[PDB]
């Protein structure tokens, strides 16, 4: 669980840099792990890790106890108000051995197969379309009280 | 109760598993009976199914409850910690005697 969580942090940050479109010297297009056999809790971690939830970009999760945050987040996704996100998380949980990835990742993987034709990379993979979410959560972790000015 | 749920839950273990039979034959024989309508509560009834016995199964949920309670019972002395698990085993045996 701690291993998977560290890798989900890594892939989330890397995908956060690729999403901004800046060139990156990434070691591999999908930095996070694929369970082959694991407990339920790891399958949950692989599912929310694959989801690239807006909550990481917003800093809604607390990283002090990262894996726990990810478990609770997978909980909220397991019964998400959004049917798309819920059915997508559930699908990711049902087939954890498959490596879900955004299409923009897959094009990178294809470029890599082009450059090095005999490269090995994980064969079992699904290319889901990411689901947009309009809710921009405010966040700022670290010391400092927020001095609201109520309207 | 608002927060004593474990107490009420244990108390439900004491609820009787029989039925309230009116004293039909005794009424027909016009035997003495101080009640306006005579009846007694039989402790248990004949098993309906070919194999399972409802009474024994009730005891099974009783000792499962008691085992959960014995399990959640915090203790400090090591021998207390021991008899907790031994208690659990012995409940588990009483269930078979009962069945």
């Amino acid at each position: 669980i701690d291993h998977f969580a560290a890798k989900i942090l890594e892939d989330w940050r890397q995908k956060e840099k690729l999403d901004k479109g800046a060139l990156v010297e990434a070691d591999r297009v999908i930095q996070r792990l694929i369970p082959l056999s694991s407990s339920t809790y790891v399958q949950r971690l692989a599912a929310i890790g694959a989801l690239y939830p807006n909550e990481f970009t917003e800093n809604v999760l607390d990283l002090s106890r990262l894996s726990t945050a990810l478990l609770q987040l997978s909980d909220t996704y397991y019964q998400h108000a959004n049917d798309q996100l819920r059915r997508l998380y559930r699908r990711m949980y049902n087939d954890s051995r498959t490596l879900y990835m955004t299409q923009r990742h897959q094009e990178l993987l294809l470029a890599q197969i082009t450059a090095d034709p005999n490269i090995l990379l994980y064969p079992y993979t699904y290319i889901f379309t990411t689901i947009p979410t309009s809710m921009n959560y405010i966040s700022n972790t670290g010391q400092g009280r927020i001095k609201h000015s109520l309207t | 109760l608002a927060g004593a749920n474990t107490i009420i839950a244990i108390m439900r273990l004491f609820t009787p598993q029989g039925f309230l039979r009116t004293d039909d034959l005794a009424i027909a024989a016009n035997f003495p009976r101080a009640s306006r309508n005579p009846q007694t509560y039989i402790p248990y009834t004949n098993q309906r199914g070919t194999v399972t016995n409802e009474f024994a199964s009730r005891f099974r949920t009783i000792v499962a409850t008691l085992a959960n309670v014995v399990n959640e019972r915090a203790v400090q002395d090591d021998m207390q910690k021991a008899t907790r698990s031994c208690t659990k085993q012995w409940l588990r045996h009483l269930e078979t005697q009962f069945d």
């Binding site: 059915r87 559930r90 699908r91 049902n94 087939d95 051995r97 064969p123 079992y124 699904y126 | -």
Partner: protein
């Protein structure tokens, strides 16, 4: 020698494929009508199947007449078969692959080393075509050449469960098959299939070309689907029955998802790992031939 008609060998009444059902010899198509599918949240998407290796395994010097049809049909649908790779007699198909070999493949499904009397056998050209692809069953086990045994089942699903729109799309929801059923239905189905002379189906699949081939694929699609069905029950993660008001609906879940299970169960035939590698290879070759 049996002449091959303009249609496949399968057109002959001698090679009818028919499961038992409702006390009669039902054709596979009219059993597959009974099949119904509960779509679930998961999605199967068919990857391109890797091209089968060019290499044809050596047919080791074997004096005997290897019963190959029995070997294959047992490896795919046999109730009790296991270690289907320790013997390695599938390589024997390659003996037929040579032009002008003295070997012949009998309707019995045995590979005689020489032509022999009173034993009818398929036209050697057609069998040469069939061996040129299916000898590669011989390298089902060899590490360099093993087939994918996870991805391939997606195709199985699409060809079994998939609606014409799903088959066109190349993607279908993972489905959970069901049908009103008799006691021990999957076993009896699997054995009615095991007795099938599938060598006819394969030899027609490999020798036929042009319109006559395509007309085969339509005429025999339900047969192929039945083999796919037996196989899919072999790898189905679980297989329950459902009470349905004084009727019973057998329900296998899920189509197109190889659970890789190896422990046996009363409900269905079970693949040992060797049988998984073998079925994977067989699927790779047969699907490669089914799309062209």
């Amino acid at each position: 020698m049996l002449q091959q008609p303009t249609g496949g060998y399968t057109t002959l009444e001698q090679f009818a494929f028919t499961i038992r059902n409702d006390g009669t010899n039902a054709t596979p198509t009219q059993f597959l009508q009974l099949l119904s599918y509960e779509a679930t949240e998961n999605e199967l998407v068919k990857k391109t199947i890797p091209t089968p290796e060019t290499h044809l395994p050596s047919a080791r010097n074997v004096p005997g007449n290897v019963y190959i049809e029995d070997a294959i049909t047992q490896a795919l649908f046999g109730i009790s078969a296991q270690n289907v790779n320790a013997h390695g007699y599938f390589s024997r198909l390659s003996a037929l692959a040579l032009p002008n070999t003295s070997a012949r493949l009998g309707l019995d499904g045995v590979i005689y080393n020489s032509e022999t009397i009173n034993i009818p056998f398929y036209d050697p050209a057609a069998v040469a075509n069939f061996a040129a692809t299916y000898a590669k069953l011989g390298n089902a086990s060899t590490p360099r050449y093993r087939a994918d045994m996870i991805d391939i089942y997606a195709h199985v699903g699409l060809e079994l469960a998939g609606t014409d729109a799903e088959r066109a799309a190349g993607v279908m929801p993972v489905k959970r098959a069901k049908f009103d059923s008799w006691e021990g239905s999957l076993i009896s189905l699997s054995r009615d299939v095991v007795n099938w002379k599938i060598l006819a189906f394969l030899i027609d699949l490999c020798s036929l070309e042009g319109e006559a081939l395509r007309a085969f694929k339509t005429r025999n699609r339900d047969v192929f689907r039945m083999m796919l069905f037996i196989m899919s029950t072999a790898v189905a993660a679980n297989v329950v029955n459902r009470k349905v008001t004084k009727r019973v609906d057998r329900v296998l879940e899920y189509i197109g998802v190889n659970s890789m299970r190896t422990a046996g169960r009363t409900a269905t035939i079970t693949y040992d790992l060797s049988r998984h590698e073998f079925a994977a290879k067989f699927l790779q070759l047969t699907f490669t031939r089914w799309n062209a």
